[PDB]
Design a protein around this ligand. Structure first.
Ligand SMILES: COc1cc2onc(C)c2cc1NS(=O)(=O)c1cc(Cl)ccc1OC
Length: 134
């Protein structure tokens, strides 16, 4: 038979939402710090680039990525969520960072370049978290 299954093709899933009008939201001092200090310091770091947007499994040739990672998260999404006042509290935002880092550790192996990057970003994150306003 002449159907060789060359189509349909793969794709990336839809990215995480950055807007949800019926979601409860608040501005808090802790969230303002998470944007101004935590996100902005990580964003400019030389290790930020793999984490500045959703994993593009097509471009990066990671066809297994979304078979393994079912709760994707990235700093581009977190930045948009902070700019859009999406969060109710600091915990919701911190959980997004934790998810991002954990996804990287799940998908990859200790000592991989991308894991070294995530570990360094996570160390910085945890340092900035320890100065969160009370
Ligand atoms: C192995 O390639 C990757 C693994 C990943 O886990 N999480 C992300 C995001 C991620 C991205 C890639 N691909 S990559 O081109 O960004 C890449 C980054 C680094 Cl620091 C090292 C290798 C590499 O691709 C081979």
């Amino acid at each position: 038979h002449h159907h060789h299954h060359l189509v349909p093709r793969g794709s990336n899933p839809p990215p995480p939402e950055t807007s949800n009008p019926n979601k409860p939201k608040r501005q808090t001092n802790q969230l303002q710090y998470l944007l101004r200090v935590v996100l902005k310091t990580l964003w400019k770091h030389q290790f930020a680039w793999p984490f500045q947007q959703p994993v593009d499994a097509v471009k990066l040739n990671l066809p297994d990525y979304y078979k393994i990672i079912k709760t994707p998260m990235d700093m581009g999404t977190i930045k948009k969520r902070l700019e859009n006042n999406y969060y109710w509290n600091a915990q919701e935002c911190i959980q997004d960072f934790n998810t991002m880092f954990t996804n990287c550790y799940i998908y990859n192996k200790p000592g991989d370049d991308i894991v070294l990057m995530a570990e360094a970003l996570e160390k910085l994150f945890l340092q900035k978290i320890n100065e969160l306003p009370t």
